[PDB]
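The passage that follows is intended for readers who have already worked through the single-chain material. We present the inputs for a multi-component assembly, then the predicted structure in tokenized form, and finally a short commentary. You are encouraged to pause after the input and sketch how you expect the pieces to fit together before reading on.
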Amino acid sequence: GHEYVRHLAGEVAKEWQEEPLLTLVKEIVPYNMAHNAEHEACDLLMEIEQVDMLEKDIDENAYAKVCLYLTSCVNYVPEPENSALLRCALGVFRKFSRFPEALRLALMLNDMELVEDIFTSCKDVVVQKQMAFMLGRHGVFLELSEDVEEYEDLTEIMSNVQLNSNFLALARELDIMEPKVPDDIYKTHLENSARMNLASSFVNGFVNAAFGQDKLLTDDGNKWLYKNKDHGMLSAAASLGMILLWDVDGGLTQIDKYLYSSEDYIKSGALLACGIVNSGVRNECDPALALLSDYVLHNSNTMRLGSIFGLGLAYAGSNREDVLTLLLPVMGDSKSSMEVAGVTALACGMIAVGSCNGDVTSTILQTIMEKSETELKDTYARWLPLGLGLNHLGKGEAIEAILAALEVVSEPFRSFANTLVDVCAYAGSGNVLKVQQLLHICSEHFDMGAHQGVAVLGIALIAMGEEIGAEMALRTFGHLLRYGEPTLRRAVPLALALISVSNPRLNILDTLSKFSHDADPEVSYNSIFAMGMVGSGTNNARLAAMLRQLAQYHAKDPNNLFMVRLAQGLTHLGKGTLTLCPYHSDRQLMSQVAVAGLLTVLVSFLDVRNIILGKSHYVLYGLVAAMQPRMLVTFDEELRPLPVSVRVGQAVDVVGQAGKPKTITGFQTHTTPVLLAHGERAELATEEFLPVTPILEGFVILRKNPNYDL
Amino acid sequence: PDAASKLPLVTPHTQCRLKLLKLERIKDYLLMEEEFIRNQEQ
Amino acid sequence: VSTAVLSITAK
Amino acid sequence: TTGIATIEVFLPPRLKKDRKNLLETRLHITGRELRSKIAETFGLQENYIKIVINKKQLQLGKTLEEQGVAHNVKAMVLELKQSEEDARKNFQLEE
Amino acid sequence: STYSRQIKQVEDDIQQLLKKINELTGIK
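Having made your guess, compare it with the prediction:
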């Protein structure tokens, strides 16, 4: 009897927590495999904690269902069951020679040795090519050995040196090579100062990002570059490197003209542009380390400001020893201002994000200790914990000692640093206990309440792991905005932007539009920038209409108008071909570099009045670290483009129900060089080709199906 | 529909550990919401 | 009031 | 071998050539000489390109040995829109 | 259906908590 054995398995699971039991489970599990009730068998081993021998009893016809069920349960179970579940599912995948999806789980585990072992064990060169594509998208690089066959192509794929050419191939394919002037975004003719020039420079950088062509800077841009004034003249030059993103040869050619300027602002903006150009792509000759290294100890603080941030963006998520050893002494330098120390913290955190680097942590802690309380009152000091927090991004319980080291620090900076590092350690984990602690922090009303904004941001930074926590945190953010103190509610728009970046869902956009025209100027700026961030790179027509209406409303307010222009530039990022979402591979893999960049921008937005609206708007270029293309290329065995027919539609959960359910709904058929919106999956419409990886995102390699045309 | 009380759609429909975990996450966030609101109202 | 007992801390 | 260092030169992709090229040379030759050599053998203008060598910048005035170059080091070639001497001039005019 | 009683209890708790949230926050 099926019901009797189900009840027996339930009773066995109940009494295990309280010899023949092993025989009972070893007989029940194959039955559930036979009668297609895989998830009940998975629950059995999950309860009695013997998921080890579940692998031995898996057949070819059911590995996908058990793997998907085990992986989907990880986001909602705490440690140490996360590691056990990931390793069991990875072992099941490896036993079945499904190398790409095993590498996905290894990247989830953040086990570098396991990733290298999976990459090396596979014998299929094409499968290794696809896995190198996933590694390059994730920002993970393996130092392969020379005896490995096809070393050059594998390293080139992992280093993303071909990303720029493929992106330009898309742009030519979608005939969107034409540059867009910021006036095309503003559409001021339909409407019935240095700040606006800086806003237009930022829009010009955002819209034409990674395209390499521009009607306003690739021409004789000295007129436009000098049209800005003072520190805005900093960012415009840096924007010139944003158009040439991922193009470390052409971009550095177009930036070198500005490296000879007698003006410090243009020179350091161009240094930051050189750093931006090298972001993502991993060149072997290290051009960014060659150009920006000589200006990290310059007399001018602007020289250092551009150079350190450029080097951090270029080598973000790399954990390079040479760059870190070159950047660490900048913190303790006497001539380094608190701005330079904060930007050094940001760069060092971005370079060694999620690596728990000992030198970075020790140097940041020493810098924090040496600063006096009056110095710690400076808001740029807030970047020091962030670089520390980025050092331990997603590590979890590895910050306790660091927390102890932070106990001696004086308040209120001690509370701010503690909250920031505690949040960063549990980023993308969904730990409801940590979110409960953050809500406890946000509960107490109060200078004194600086860390409350960080706690509000951290609620989103933890709940971003999966959709259930995301929507629940949306409700929590509504409550915080209703009941919070003004310092509490100035960060809620930033949390909304973080939790739904490049995902312009209607409810969040409406919530931000309600608070866009708010009495408090800071929450208004944050709400407008969050409207820009939420629909960043989506080319949302409705969001563009709201932003144009806001520009009409905020015409007389320079700060609000600047924020509106920034949001408009973000909405049309990369002409709709780029995304800032830190989650890829069906929103299951968290890119530490993207999270680092988003944090660098959003935490700095907690002082939008003095940082973003002041002389430090260049920190917006941290979004470059999070700039990835919403990609779908099908390549042949020799990496040449292969136009194929695919069906693109909103992703549908498959776990649970049996059969072969449709994974997409409301789909349409397009040729493969197409852009995927957030939450949109793509599947091969025909059976002519077999993808190397199940996930049809980024660069995908297709093989000829022998069964087709039998 | 019911506006504020739109809860996320839990999957799968079949009763299993995964659905229990998703529903418990929803319950945890609702409990945290209740605590926060009861603290802020007073 | 009293710390709400979440599912995780129930152990 | 025999004072021969094969620099691993990385050319720009706009010149559709081999991505990685070996170039053997002696070590006490000056940076200007090295720049001229990579200009001539790979067909580029001597004064219109910049060499990034050993993760640093090529010091034209100084010889290769004092820059710390060695065997199998990598050198990336960057093309220039304006030459290194007239760019400063026209930017000084653009003041 | 070993979690049927647990799922039912959690769903009832969810509904009670949602009703309490609506009562405290107003929305009527």
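Commentary: Residues 3 and 9 of chain C are 11 Å apart (CA to CA). The radius of gyration of chain C is 7 Å. How closely did your sketch match?
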